[PDB]
Amino acid sequence: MTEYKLVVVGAGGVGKSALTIQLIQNHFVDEYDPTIEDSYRKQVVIDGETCLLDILDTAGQEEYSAMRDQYMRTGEGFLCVFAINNTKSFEDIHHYREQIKRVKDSEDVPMVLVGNKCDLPSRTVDTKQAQDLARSYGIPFIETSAKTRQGVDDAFYTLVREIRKHKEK
Ligand SMILES: Nc1nc2c(ncn2[C@@H]2O[C@H](COP(=O)(O)OP(=O)(O)O)[C@@H](O)[C@H]2O)c(=O)[nH]1
Numbered sequence: 001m002t003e004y005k006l007v008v009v010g011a012g013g014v015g016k017s018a019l020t021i022q023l024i025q026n027h028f029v030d031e032y033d034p035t036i037e038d039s040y041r042k043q044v045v046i047d048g049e050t051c052l053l054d055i056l057d058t059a060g061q062e063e064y065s066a067m068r069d070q071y072m073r074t075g076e077g078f079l080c081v082f083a084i085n086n087t088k089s090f091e092d093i094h095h096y097r098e099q100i101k102r103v104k105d106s107e108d109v110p111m112v113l114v115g116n117k118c119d120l121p122s123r124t125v126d127t128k129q130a131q132d133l134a135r136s137y138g139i140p141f142i143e144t145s146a147k148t149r150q151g152v153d154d155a156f157y158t159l160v161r162e163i164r165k166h167k168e169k
């Protein structure tokens with residue numbers, strides 16, 4: 001049983017916790033503490049491989065930067081989820097990608113761009129914009145919704161494969 005350590009990083013309010021809890025508790029949480037940083041584990045036999053997923057629902061700000069940067073190094077795959085109805089979170093993608101790349105000191109870092117809230121209206125971030133960015137980074141992008149669980153299943157699976165892809169280069 002192989003263990004995969006992945007961290008869901010992004011802006012606050014994008015739905016980091018809900019997206020993960022949906023695949024852990026099998027239901028959508030309407031109200032959940034945004035400052036909670038818990039780690040959930042899930043075992044799935046994906047691609048004929050029985051692996052154990054180690055995920056961490058980031059809050060946003062830790063007591064010390066070194067503590068936040070700690071799991072930034074141990075993270076093999078990072079799920080970059082943003083809100084299509086919040087352009088502010090989409091622009092922050094540049095900072096995260098650049099920052100985490102520096103922390104690990106690598107240009108080839110397994111990441112998947114995720115556009116949450118695809119089931120909600122008032123979309124300011126067009127799909128093309130997100131896709132354009134993902135194609136420039138050299139990573140995949142899929143729209144998702146924690147409420148309908150659309151794309152979320154694929155996104156999480158893709159991240160694991162991206163990790164494997166990086167470890168089989
Ligand atoms: N309608 C809708 N709300 C979502 C979605 N994902 C998360 N939310 C809501 O966003 C708010 C914060 O969710 P939370 O799990 O704390 O995400 P986080 O704080 O960004 O890690 C809550 O009201 C969630 O129910 C979604 O996909 N669709």
Ligand SMILES: NC(=O)[C@H](NNC(=O)c1c[nH]c2ccccc12)c1ccccc1
Nearest residue numbers: 005006007039054055056067071074075
């Ligand atoms: N945030 C935490 O619980 C940190 N430990 N856990 C982790 O790093 C991991 C938990 N889930 C992960 C997913 C991918 C990589 C790492 C982890 C932590 C932070 C500060 C001090 C001591 C421990």
